[PDB]
Every structure is written in structure tokens, then in C-alpha cells.
Design a protein around this ligand. Sequence first.
Ligand SMILES: [Ca+2]
Ligand SMILES: [Ca+2]
Length: 269
Amino acid sequence: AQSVPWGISRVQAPAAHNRGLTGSGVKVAVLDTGISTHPDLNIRGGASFVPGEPSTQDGNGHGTHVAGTIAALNNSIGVLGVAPNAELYAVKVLGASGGGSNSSIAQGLEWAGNNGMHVANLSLGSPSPSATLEQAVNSATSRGVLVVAASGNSGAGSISYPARYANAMAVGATDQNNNRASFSQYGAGLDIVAPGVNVQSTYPGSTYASLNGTSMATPHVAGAAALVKQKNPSWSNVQIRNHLKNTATSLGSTNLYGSGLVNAEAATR
Ligand SMILES: [Ca+2]
Ligand SMILES: [Ca+2]
């Protein structure tokens, strides 16, 4: 039996699926710890930029979990993605420990741009600015990729990098009451928020797990961007970004919530 995780329902993705929008034909790169083969996922390709981890399989679990929130398959098992027909690419920029380098992350972004990805999901952060990261984000953006990044889980009033760079869309996390999750970083640069508490998704070993974090929120937004691109094939990264903010459900102060809660229904109206 297939279950619909609460956050998928909260961003109203099934309404968009009922309009026939499922992310078909949209290329989405997951820059993370990899993505493992899973009965509820379809991986179309990928690349690794971790020294000594030449495969794209996931030795951590984080990347597989993030991938399922974007595109777990619509079928008789498991869970369901915001964009269950999106084309998933596994771009390994983090090692099994969950950490990587600004150089691997930047290589991943360059790969996404060079390979015509439409959306790049970065459920990761670096605590400090890096000109290398910034130029990579800028480069991918100028080639046409929409970069979506997590605000981070320290609870502080400033957001992590590369989410804090202007050309990266910054996503924070809400809970089931549509309040900001205590850990979700906020402040200058925050664009939008999405469910990030008790998020069930796909996990290595053909299983499912629940996790918390802005890493879990971010793929809700990447998924929604995929639905908007299927409806509006000519739209640029910038148009998609602005339309998501414009159609989000306001939750209050932009400092804490950016435009508010991503709404897949209102954005594909
Ligand atoms: Ca499924
Ligand atoms: Ca930003």
C-alpha cells in the first residue's frame, strides 16, 4: 500500500497531480550523499565528485531520503514524491559521513549546468562563505539551472551557505502546525519554507525512514519547481522562483518564513 507523507499533502502536491502535473520531462539533480537503487525510485543517471567514491550509490541514507521526497514513484508501495515523474540524477558531492568539500559541491553544480538540469537540490550547507561555491552557484544559474538550498539546522537568525547567496533559493522548515521548526535557520535571504519535521521517505535497504531538518524541507520546494516547469516549459529559473514565492501561503514575517509555505496547488493554477 502507498502512503502519502503529511508534508506532501501539506504542500498540496496531490491537487497538482490531479491536474496532470507530475514533473514529467523535468531533470532534477540531487547534490547529496548519492541515491541508492530502491523499488520506489527511478534514477536516470548521475556523477560522483567524491574522491574515492566513484559510484553514485548512497552510503549514508540522506541523499536517498531527499530523493524520495522529490520523486518517490506513484504506485502501490512506499510513499509519493512531490513530482513523482521527475527525472532524477544522483550527483554525489558528499561522502558517507555526510560531509564533503566546497570543491566537490562546486563540481556538482558545474556538472548540473553542463548537463541541462532544470533544478538542482542542495540539501547541505557550509558555515562560511566560499568564493568557489558562490561562482559555482552563479555559473549554474546563468546556464539556466534553478538552485534550491537548505537554510540549515543551527536554529540561528542567519542562514547557511550556499543558501545565503543571492542566486540560490533558500528553504527553511516548518512543523505540522505551520510554525517554524525550532532548528530552522532564518533571516536575511530566506525565500520560502516547507515541511521539515517527521518526514517519511525512501532509505537505503529498500526501506523507509523519518527524518527532521531543512534538508527535508528543501526537496518539497525542488519538487514544486518541477511541477511548475512541466506546466510552463518556457519559464526560466527566475520566473519559477518568483512564482513559487508569489503563490506561497504567507505565514507572517518574511524574516522567519520568507514568502511563506510553498503551495503546489496555487503555483500550478
Ligand atoms: Ca510509491
Ligand atoms: Ca539565497
